[model samples]
Target: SQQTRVLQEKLRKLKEAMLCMVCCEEEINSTFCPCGHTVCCESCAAQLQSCPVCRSRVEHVQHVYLPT
Candidate 1:
């Protein structure tokens, strides 16, 4: 029971943080900026040259790979 609670907590945090703005999908895979918003998955990120949330040019990128 205790371990289940801990797992639920972590899953909730990941889901909250990784909700993609473009499709509201699971699994955000990268960070793109000058907008500096972490709100897109790999597919959406590839389709954009500007941030979806702010319309700022994406001048940098870093992948976000979570533990499996």
Candidate 2:
């Protein structure tokens, strides 16, 4: 039961992160750097080299940030 509970909790966290990656959260403001990796917020992406989601060379892409 403990193992099952751990697995469920992990799954829930993964699901929440994935959902946040897709839909912007007001407090979190998730985004992907040009590297195509999911980050917690626009600031996280900006600090990275490329698009965290697409890895498409984000330096050239227009930036939009969510309110903290």
Candidate 3:
């Protein structure tokens, strides 16, 4: 039960932060910040140089494909 709860929590947070890198809606791809904030895709993230929530400068980004 504890393991399940931990797993669920991880999935929940990942799903919560995961959003379209292009639109910031609907899960498309996920990005990470230096401060450990999961962000949307490049297209949508291009609008800002930093995380919208914490304003931390973005350092690296990677591609993430989603199902159609």
Top lDDT model = 1
Candidate 1 collision pairs:
none
Instruction: Give model 3's TM-score versus the native structure.
Output: 0.45
Clashes of 2: 20
lDDT of 1 by residue, 1-68 (tens): 99999999999887777677777765777789655677788788888887877788888777787673
Determine which window of 10 residues in candidate 1 has minimal summed lDDT.
Answer: 33-42
Positional deviation of residue 65's Cα in model 1 after best superposition, in angstroms: 2.7
* lDDT of model number 1: 0.78
Q: Could you give candidate 3's per-residue lDDT for residues 3-68 as a string of tens digits?
A: 999999999878765665447566646465566555566666656677766878878655555563
* RMSD each, Å: 3.9, 6.9, 6.2
How many backbone overlaps does candidate 3 show?
A: 1
User: For residues 2-68, could you state the per-residue lDDT of candidate 2 as single tens digits?
Assistant: 9999999999786566444533552345444344344555545446565655556764333446443
The TM-score that candidate 1 achieves is 0.59
Off by over 4 Å in 1: 1-17
Give the Cα error of residue 51 in candidate 1, in Å: 0.9
